[PDB]
Design an enzyme around this catalytic site. Structure first.
Site: not given
Length: 330
Positions: A35, A199
């Site tokens: 994770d 992004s």
């Protein structure tokens, strides 16, 4: 040193991925959820409340000759999906795919919430975010990657998650045969303890690319892709019959639909998520309403590049002095 381990979807939807981890002497092998959105290595154990164990494999520290109680240390964690666990702490030997760390903090669960009990395939989590998020008190502990870093050939690990198929976590090297083209690296902020990046935009299907900054985290422990409501609305508007359902808790779509792809920007580069990756199947057994893999982050506080996005790429988690993230197509 290096390590290399296969990671396997826990079910036919890729709801999560499990990776075998050797703990203790002799080895006890547990299948853990790697994770990159948390920083605790915790396991079902011989200390876990018996009614909260239902098929998991447990760590028994009293059977490990290298286990030592970390005196006075406790841990308690709550995840974004509302689940939680807590317990005490041992140090022990932990190996992943041939790579060994001695003295790793192994957080032994005394309590787990129902969603963990109900998932017999996941024996614990192995956190790979930054150690500043680790919950051990009063002395915060380091992640497995942090402990191994200095020994690794290169201070990196990589996530190569499969679509409906096994994939690979590598430590200490970049397998140049595992991706196409080149790796595009992008800046990371560690200020929230996450692999947080920006992004450069998105496209829906064959649509034109929209240049817009989307701050989010690369999180292998989250199944879906969580993005701003504007972006998610633009995607599901291309699917006839798709709608946001408050009763279900997200966007649903007719299971008879063919989904468009979703592209996200990494600098000047582009990662394409095929439409099939965004289908998470009937909302309930036998339903013709299917659950979408792209969902709004409006109720989270952060955008999450979860497995739906990451499985479309080869992802480099570069833990150099100034960390960065790298993305390649594959």
């Amino acid at each position: 040193s290096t390590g290399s381990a296969t990671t396997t979807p826990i079910d036919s939807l890729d709801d999560a991925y499990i990776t075998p981890v050797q703990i203790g002497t002799p080895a006890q092998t547990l299948n853990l959820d790697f994770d990159t959105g948390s920083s605790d290595l915790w396991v079902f154990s011989s200390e876990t409340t018996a009614s909260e164990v239902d098929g998991q494999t447990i760590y028994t520290p009293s059977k490990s000759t290298t286990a030592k109680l970390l005196s006075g240390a406790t841990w308690s964690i709550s995840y974004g999906d509302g689940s939680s666990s807590s317990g005490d702490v041992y140090t022990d030997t932990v190996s992943v795919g041939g790579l060994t760390v001695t003295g790793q903090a192994v957080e032994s669960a005394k309590k787990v919430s129902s969603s963990f009990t109900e998932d017999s395939t996941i024996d614990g989590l192995l956190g790979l975010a930054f150690s500043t998020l680790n919950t051990v008190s009063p002395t915060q502990q380091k992640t497995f990657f942090d402990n191994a870093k200095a020994s690794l050939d290169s201070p990196v690990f990589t996530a190569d998650l499969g679509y409906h198929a096994p994939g690979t976590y590598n430590f200490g090297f970049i397998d140049t045969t595992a991706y196409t083209g080149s790796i595009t690296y992008t800046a990371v902020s560690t200020k929230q303890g996450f692999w947080e990046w920006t992004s450069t935009g998105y496209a829906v299907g064959s649509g034109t690319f929209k240049s817009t900054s989307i701050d989010g985290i690369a999180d292998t422990g989250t199944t879906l892709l969580y993005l701003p409501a504007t972006v998610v609305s633009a995607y599901w508007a291309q699917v006839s019959g798709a709608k946001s359902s408050s009763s279900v808790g997200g966007y649903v779509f007719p299971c008879s639909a063919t989904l468009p792809s979703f592209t996200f920007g990494v600098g000047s580069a582009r990662i394409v998520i095929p439409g099939d990756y965004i289908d998470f199947g009937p909302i309930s057994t036998g339903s013709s309403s299917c659950f979408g893999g792209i969902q709004s982050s409006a109720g989270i506080g952060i955008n999450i590049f979860g497995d739906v996005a990451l499985k479309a790429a080869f992802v480099v988690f570069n833990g150099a002095t100034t960390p960065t993230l790298g993305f390649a197509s594959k």
